[PDB]
Every structure is written in structure tokens, then in C-alpha cells.
């Protein structure tokens, strides 16, 4: 409904029941519903034509190793299980089978100076690799990480294969004069890899999945929690402020009026968090002119992406300010 004009950017004329008899008494508007359905399917295709669902899902399944016919249908158990089992049964185990965060009290208050958006894309695969956790590698019956002095085992090895394949993509991407075909191939491939990497930990918290060894999940949560906490106190040192936190996001204050030193502070903290751990990444994604805070998932802001020549496009953004009581004047 909304998507009709967000990505697709057109109109969606819709007709309830009581006008269906009107259109029974009508040839122009009935035919109009017909051509409307025509355009409906059309826009429905344009969805794929732009988002490139087909080759994306295709490549994913290719790397996933499971029935694409059961892929579109929706699932995270499949695109994790039927992938992991590939390797796990090169390692002559025997698995079981089928049967039947932290808020940080967002300090609401308008903000005037520029605001930066830190993304912890790839946080859970990151921490898991960083601390070499794998089923075989914990006396799981409160649990504790072993000495990293062992050789990395099974699951982080697969995570590492995925990460280095992302590295491969990022390396060969810097080419020039490539046919737009292989260009899009690369970019979409990278997207797909990031998709499954973010999916990764999901294969555990979903109790009804096979590998639901919950102590794993408890441990990982504890770890990421302390991760975020250290992050907060470290940047807190830096004479700045930290308004909103979440498992996979940090909305942070910047407290300045310039535009370039901003990126310097970005790169600064980008290296700071790396001083904690190398494999862990961070993304200096977006910049806000001024911003209002009501809740996560519900606020108002000015997306200010820096256009070339140090200029910037500025658009409003109203994340969820509806007016439900259709009663006013």
C-alpha cells in the first residue's frame, strides 16, 4: 500500500465492496479495475526489476544449499541449517534432527548540532569469530569461554570463510570499466553475503531450531552487552554524548557545527573500537542536521547526506507520527 509510492512512486486506486455493484452497473470503471489489475501486476514486477529479488535470492540459495522453492516462502531455519550441515558432515559428526538486548534509556530532547549514526553491521558474527566459540569448544553443563590458545575449530571457520569472501568481493569491486552486468553481480553478491552473515546468529535463538544450545545464546548476549557498555564508556571519555543504544545501532551526538572534522571524529572512534578488537567493524553511515527523540522506531529527523563538493541533500523524515483519532478539526 505505502510501497506503491515509496519505491514504485505512483498511485494505487482501490475499490471496496459497495462500489462493486456500481461497477457491475459500469463499463468504464469496471474495465478500469481490469486495467488497474494490469498495472497492479506490472508494478508488482517492477518491484523485482528494481530490488532484483530474483538473482539475489538465486545467488543466496546457491551459497545457501537448500531448496530455493522453499526459500522465497520465507525461512531462517532452512538457510542456516541446510548450509551448516554441508560442512558439518564433512567432519563426520552426527547431528540431531527435526521433531515437533539492552536499552540505554534514550535521553529524549531536541538536538540542534549535527548528529551521527553509527551502525554495528556484522556484530554477532564478529564477536563469535573474535572469541572462537563452537559447539565442541565449551563444557556446556554458568558457562565460560575457554582459553583462545586452542586452534580455531569448526563454526568460526565457516563464518571466516564468509567474511573473507566478503573481503574478496570488496577487493575485486575496486575495478574499473567493468560491464555493468558484473558490476551489479559483485554488488548484489556482497549484499547477499551480508544478508546471511546477519542471519547467522538467528540459527540459535530460534528455540525450535536444531542447534538451540541456549547456553550459547546466553553467553553471546552477555558478551555483546559488555561490548556495548565498553563502547559507551570509551566514547563517553571522548568529551561527547551518547543518546541511543541498541544491539545493532548507536545513535550518537556529535556536538559541532562544521562538516569535515565530523568525519575525523568518525574515523577516530572507528579506530578506537578497533583498539578493543580487530575483526569487529563499524560503519559511519549517516549524518543528521537536527533531530527530535520520542522513542526508538518513532521520531522525526532531517536526513542530510553529504552530496559532492561537501554539499548535502536534506530531506525530512517522519518515522511514525500518525494521528489515529480521526476526530480533530
Amino acid at each position: 500500500s505505502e510501497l506503491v509510492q515509496q519505491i514504485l512512486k505512483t498511485e494505487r486506486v482501490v475499490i471496496p465492496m459497495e462500489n462493486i455493484q456500481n461497477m457491475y452497473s459500469e463499463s468504464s470503471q469496471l474495465l478500469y479495475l481490469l486495467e488497474h489489475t494490469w498495472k497492479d501486476a506490472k508494478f508488482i514486477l517492477q518491484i523485482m526489476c528494481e530490488l532484483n529479488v530474483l538473482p539475489l535470492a538465486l545467488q543466496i540459495t546457491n551459497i545457501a544449499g537448500n531448496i530455493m522453492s522453499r526459500t522465497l516462502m520465507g525461512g531462517r531455519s532452512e538457510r542456516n541449517e541446510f548450509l551448516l550441515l554441508h560442512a558439518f558432515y564433512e567432519n563426520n559428526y552426527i547431528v540431531p534432527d527435526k521433531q515437533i538486548g539492552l536499552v540505554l534509556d534514550p535521553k529524549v530532547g531536541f538536538y540542534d548540532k549535527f548528529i551521527l549514526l553509527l551502525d554495528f553491521n556484522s556484530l554477532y558474527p564478529s564477536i563469535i569469530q573474535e572469541f572462537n566459540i563452537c559447539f565442541t569448544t565449551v563444557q556446556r553443563v554458568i558457562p565460560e569461554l575457554p582459553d583462545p590458545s586452542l586452534e580455531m575449530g569448526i563454526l568460526p571457520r565457516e563464518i571466516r570463510k564468509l567474511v573473507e569472501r566478503r573481503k574478496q568481493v570488496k577487493q575485486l569491486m575496486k575495478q574499473q570499466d567493468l560491464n555493468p552486468d558484473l558490476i551489479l553481480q559483485y554488488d548484489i553478491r556482497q549484499k547477499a553475503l551480508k544478508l546471511t552473515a546477519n542471519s547467522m546468529y538467528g540459527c540459535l535463538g530460534f528455540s525450535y531450531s536444531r542447534f538451540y544450545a541456549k547456553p550459547l545464546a546466553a553467553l553471546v548476549t552477555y558478551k555483546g552487552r559488555e561490548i556495548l557498555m565498553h563502547t559507551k564508556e570509551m566514547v563517553q571519555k571522548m568529551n561527547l554524548e551518547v543518546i541511543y543504544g541498541d544491539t545493532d545501532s548507536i545513535m550518537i551526538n556529535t556536538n559541532s557545527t562544521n562538516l569535515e572534522e565530523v568525519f575525523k571524529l568518525g574515523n577516530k572512534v572507528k579506530s578506537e573500537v578497533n583498539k578493543l578488537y580487530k575483526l569487529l567493524e563499524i560503519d559511519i553511515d549517516g549524518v543528521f542536521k537536527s533531530l527530535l527523540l520520542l522513542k526508538k522506531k518513532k521520531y522525526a529527523a532531517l536526513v542530510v547526506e553529504p552530496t559532492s563538493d561537501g554539499n548535502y541533500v536534506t530531506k525530512q523524515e517522519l518515522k511514525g507520527l500518525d494521528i489515529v483519532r480521526r476526530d480533530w478539526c
Partner: protein, 182 residues
């Protein structure tokens, strides 16, 4: 932000309000229950302790009435719905209004009130404390010399006792350590 104590006079017909033990000004200060407020009339409400007692209970026994019947009200400052049929879905803050499906729900008489108010009662009947906390020697000695018998004291003691026991009966002052460190 609580509700004061209002009181009916048994003889003069007027009404009263009992905020703090002492009735106002400094060296002049006098006990609450001493004289009816209405300037002229000279009845002294103290001598009707027991009657006061009644209203005390017959008042508290509606505050509790509210809570266990606690309303439920909406939060998103537009919706403003009021009901009791607690719905079943849930989220971080708690449950969610059925209409404004994007918002929480709050109790009305937040327990914090109820306990606050019961403290507010137990406050103004336990003069002993406020007497002890008083600074100036001579004021204390003179007023005690004046009109703090065993009788007056004992009557305060009686009503204050009723209040205090009636809250500490069982709701809130306890924190069961045996479940807090397991």
C-alpha cells in the same frame, strides 16, 4: 500531590483539614486536634478521638477500594482510552491498547500513590517524631510544660497506631531478601 485529610466537626458543623501536626506558626504552634478551626466555637475536637478513629478507617477503606479495582488508562497523549479489561499482548513497557496499537498502557492509581498516601496519614498522627526533631530548647520545654499530658499523647498514639498497623499489615514495606539473593 496527595489528598489531604478533611474532617467533619461533631458540633459546630464546619469542616477542617489536618495537614501538619503543628497548626502553623512557630512559637505559637499548637497541636492539630486541640480546637475547632472556626474562630468562635469553642468545642475541642480532641475529646472525640474515637469519632475521628471511625472516619479514619471509614476513609482508608475506600482508597484500597480504588486500587484493587484499579482503572487502566492510555499513554499516547492523543488516544486517551479508559478501561479495565486487561488485554493479553505485551511488549517492553507492558501491554498495548487495543485501539492505539502503537502505545503502552498505564495504571491509574499507581501503587506508589497508595503507599505515599498511607505514609501521609501516618505522618500527622505521630507527633512524637516532629516533636523530637525540633531545634530550639526553650520552645520545646515550654510547649511540653503547656499541654503534652500522657492523655493527649496517648490519643495520638492510638490513632497513629491504627493507621500504621493498617498499612504495615501487608503490602509494601517488606522486601523478601530470601528471594532477592538466590
Amino acid at each position: 500531590d496527595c489528598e489531604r485529610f478533611k474532617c467533619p466537626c461533631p458540633t459546630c458543623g464546619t469542616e477542617n483539614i489536618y495537614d501538619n501536626v503543628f497548626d502553623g506558626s512557630g512559637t505559637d504552634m499548637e497541636p492539630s486536634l486541640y480546637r475547632c478551626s472556626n474562630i468562635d466555637c469553642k468545642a475541642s475536637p480532641l475529646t472525640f478521638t474515637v469519632q475521628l478513629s471511625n472516619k479514619l478507617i471509614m476513609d482508608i477503606r475506600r482508597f484500597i477500594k480504588k486500587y484493587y479495582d484499579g482503572w487502566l488508562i492510555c499513554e499516547e497523549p492523543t488516544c486517551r482510552n479508559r478501561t479495565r479489561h486487561l488485554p493479553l499482548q505485551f511488549s517492553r513497557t507492558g501491554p498495548l491498547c487495543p485501539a492505539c496499537m502503537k502505545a503502552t498502557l498505564q495504571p491509574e492509581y499507581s501503587d506508589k500513590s497508595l503507599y505515599t498516601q498511607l505514609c501521609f496519614y501516618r505522618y500527622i498522627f505521630d507527633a512524637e517524631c516532629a516533636l523530637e526533631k525540633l531545634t530550639t530548647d526553650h520552645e520545646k520545654d515550654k510547649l511540653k510544660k503547656q499541654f503534652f499530658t500522657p492523655k493527649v499523647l496517648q490519643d495520638y498514639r492510638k490513632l497513629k497506631n491504627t493507621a500504621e498497623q493498617f498499612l504495615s499489615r501487608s503490602g509494601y514495606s517488606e522486601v523478601n531478601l530470601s528471594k532477592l539473593f538466590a
